[PDB]
């Protein structure tokens, strides 16, 4: 249960959840309702939780009695950047279901959804500049660039089966892992801990996020749309060749033709899907997630033994057992 | 896309620094306000923050137009994928994001939190207001101040921020910087309402009733009638106001000129003074 997993920082999340409503304002009922749609749809709030967990462990190590106001704002900032990414991702992937509810672009047109994401990006970087830490300012600005860089790169290698796993991990760093890595390090920065601790907190966030996206790519093959709350079996059909396919593409070369066919033949997608399950593609991709999770756990031993650290120890083990 | 705007900008800024020795509008304002405030502060050359502020602003302006043209398909139950391939939707949003991201990334690397607070604010209200623009179309109940505010967020606010951050990067007094925000706001409004005139002389066909139409809809007893709807379909000529539309810009323009009087006599302060005059010269 994600509820029990995030128990030690449950109270911190409830303050954030009651606060995202006003995080955009009230002058614009369209933008307000567009935000209530995706915020109220029921996200997992995993990115604010890790910020909360890292902020507390590194605050105990630094002698702070409570959390700074910039800790609690940072958690609201990362979630709003994550939300802005999802909005722009759905317009890109032509997805009509997010978190069990209809996506914004199919309610208010693609333009308003794009502007809502543009607003959420500038809004978070505006809050972030008001936190006055210049180092976090540049770090998060790098992440906003990484989301666009990965999406342009992911859009240009579709149906290209000679894509390497090296490219696949770099792509998933840009669009998913860079934000999570910057959020865990920026939390350590607002606690004032040493540079080495700052660096290892960033290394936990990038490796947990890397395996997190690998699992997100697995659940597209192994879970239903109703289960995930978002369209399932969509990456392969669009030409986005995730780790199960790249692993599978090494032994069963019939995949190459079907994907280079752009699945034009009727029945081709159904047979290509079973060719992925045919091979050890799904399980070989899972062990890539386990390895990325192994590196993430090692970065935690720099911290003392605390239930904040052991929850952060549990969050990768929860990733490998997650049906979403 | 991003790499192409910087090229013709790096060249256009040189074509002006060469002309100053003995679109293109936004970095010209940054360049001339940068040097005017620079010589006042004892800076013998434009710093790097001034040079890369000019490309920051145009990248925001250009990325704005790209995202503003994203298609509305709300009530489309036909072929969504066909119109998006036809109008390059997925390409437009990705390039606009990357241009928006590289701009704030440049801005973040300048290590001035006051400019970052100001610029991100400009983008924020641009996105919010453009979401709200759907309602104000076909609405009789806007005042002249409500029009100047939508026209601020649309264009004028970005120009005012560019001219004040140019003064901030010269490290001069905050009163001269505040006067530099005032040069841009006004010239921006004065530039927006003169653009709103040029089209009508369609923008009301979609429902954008600018300052000409609000100086009307007052005298013109009805007017609201026609815009209340298809109707007589004729009379869609207009009525036609413009006297209070070429004077509205003339008044804002002389407020911008008045803000330049804190700067000493210089070839940049006079070129900036001629910027307002050249905007009204299109009459
Ligand atoms: O599969 P995607 O990477 O597009 C996704 O994980 C979202 N996303 C977008 C960028 N990083 C992650 P989602 O499946 O939620 O649609
Ligand atoms: C980066 C991608 C994988 C986001 C989707 O997974 P999440 O589980 O993090 O999305 P929400 O719960 O917040 O809706
Ligand atoms: Mg995607
Ligand atoms: Mg997607
Ligand atoms: Mg996915």
UniProtKB/Swiss-Prot annotation, chain A:
One of its GO terms (molecular function) is prenyltransferase activity. Mg(2+) 1 binds at residues 89, 93. The keyword Zinc does not apply. One of its GO terms (cellular component) is chloroplast. It is found in: Plastid, Chloroplast. It comes from the Eukaryota. It catalyses: 7 isopentenyl diphosphate + (2E)-geranyl diphosphate = all-trans-nonaprenyl diphosphate + 7 diphosphate. An all-trans-polyprenyl diphosphate binds at residues 98, 175-176, 213, 230. Mg(2+) 2 binds at residues 89, 93. One of its GO terms (biological process) is isoprenoid biosynthetic process. Keywords: Chloroplast, Isoprene biosynthesis, Magnesium, Metal-binding, Plastid, Transferase, Transit peptide. Its cofactor is Mg(2+). Its main location: plastid. The keyword Transit peptide applies. Binds 2 Mg(2+) ions per subunit. Isopentenyl diphosphate binds at residues 44, 47, 82, 99. Its EC number is 2.5.1.84. Involved in providing solanesyl diphosphate for plastoquinone-9 (PQ-9) formation. Belongs to the FPP/GGPP synthase family. Homodimer. This is Probable solanesyl-diphosphate synthase 3, chloroplastic. It comes from Oryza sativa subsp. japonica. The chain holds residues 91 to 414 of 414 of the full protein.
């Amino acid at each position: 249960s994600v509820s029990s997993l995030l128990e030690v920082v449950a109270d911190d999340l409830l303050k954030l959840n009651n606060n995202l409503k006003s995080l955009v304002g009230a002058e614009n009922p369209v933008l307000v309702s567009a935000a209530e749609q995706i915020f109220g749809a029921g996200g997992k709030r995993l990115r604010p939780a890790l910020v909360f967990l890292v902020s507390r462990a590194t605050a105990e190590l630094a002698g702070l009695l409570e959390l700074t106001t910039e800790h609690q704002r940072l958690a609201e900032i990362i979630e709003m950047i994550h939300t802005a990414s999802l909005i722009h991702d759905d317009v890109i992937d032509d997805s009509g279901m997010r978190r069990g509810k209809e996506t914004i672009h199919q309610l208010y047109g693609t333009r308003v959804a794009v502007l809502a994401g543009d607003f959420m990006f500038a809004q978070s970087s505006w809050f972030l500049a008001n936190l006055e830490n210049i180092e976090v300012i540049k770090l998060i600005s790098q992440v906003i660039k990484d989301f666009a860089s990965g999406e342009i790169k992911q859009a240009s290698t579709l149906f290209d089966c000679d894509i390497t796993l090296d490219d696949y991990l770099l792509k998933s760093y840009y669009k998913t892992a860079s934000l999570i890595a910057a959020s865990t390090r920026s939390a350590a920065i607002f606690s004032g801990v040493s540079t080495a601790i700052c660096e290892q907190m960033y290394e936990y966030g990038r490796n947990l996020g890397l395996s997190f996206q690998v699992v997100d790519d697995i659940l597209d093959f192994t879970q239903s749309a109703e289960q995930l709350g978002k369209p399932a079996g969509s990456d392969l059909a669009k030409g986005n060749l995730t780790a199960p396919v790249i692993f599978a593409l090494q032994d069963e070369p019939q995949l190459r033709e079907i994907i280079d066919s752009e699945f034009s033949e009727t029945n081709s997608l159904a047979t290509a899907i079973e060719l992925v399950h045919r091979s050890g593609g799904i399980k070989r991709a899972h062990e890539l997630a386990r390895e990325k999770g192994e590196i993430a756990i090692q970065s935690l031993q720099c911290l003392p033994r605390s239930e904040f650290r052991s929850t952060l120890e549990n969050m990768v083990k929860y990733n490998l057992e997650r049906i979403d």
